[PDB]
Amino acid sequence: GPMEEQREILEQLKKTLQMLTVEL
Amino acid sequence: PMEEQREILEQLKKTLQMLTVEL
Amino acid sequence: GPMEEQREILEQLKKTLQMLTVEL
């Protein structure tokens, strides 16, 4: 199910974005 | 100048905090 | 810190942000 793949990868981005806001 | 840019990055980092919060 | 590290963070922020725009 893509309904969940998209979700998990969306939360993956939000991770890395949280990390890059930390770094700045 | 780096003061103004630093201000910009301050605004930016704040914005990203909001964005990531809403995500 | 060094200019190079700053350049890498900005470039990665651009890419991650673009991906976020792909997924939503």
SS3 C1: coil
- Selecting from A9, A10, A20 the residue whose C-beta is nearest the C-beta of C12 gives A20
Cβ A18–B19 below 8 Å, yes or no?
no
CA–CA separation, C7 and C12 (whole Å): 9
Closest to C14 in 3D by CA, of A23, A6, B23, A17:
A17
Q: How was this structure determined?
A: X-ray
Cβ A17–B12 below 8 Å, yes or no?
no
Beta-carbon neighbour count of residue B4 at 10 Å? 8
The alpha carbon of C7 is separated from its chain's Cα centroid by a whole number of angstroms, namely: 9
Place of tokens 């199910």: A1
C6-13 long-range contacts, CB within 8 A, separation 24+: C9/A20, C9/A23, C9/A24, C12/A20, C13/A17, C13/A20, C13/A24
Cβ B20–A18 below 8 Å, yes or no?
yes
Phi/psi region, residue C2 (left: phi>0; alpha: psi -120 to 50; beta: rest), is beta
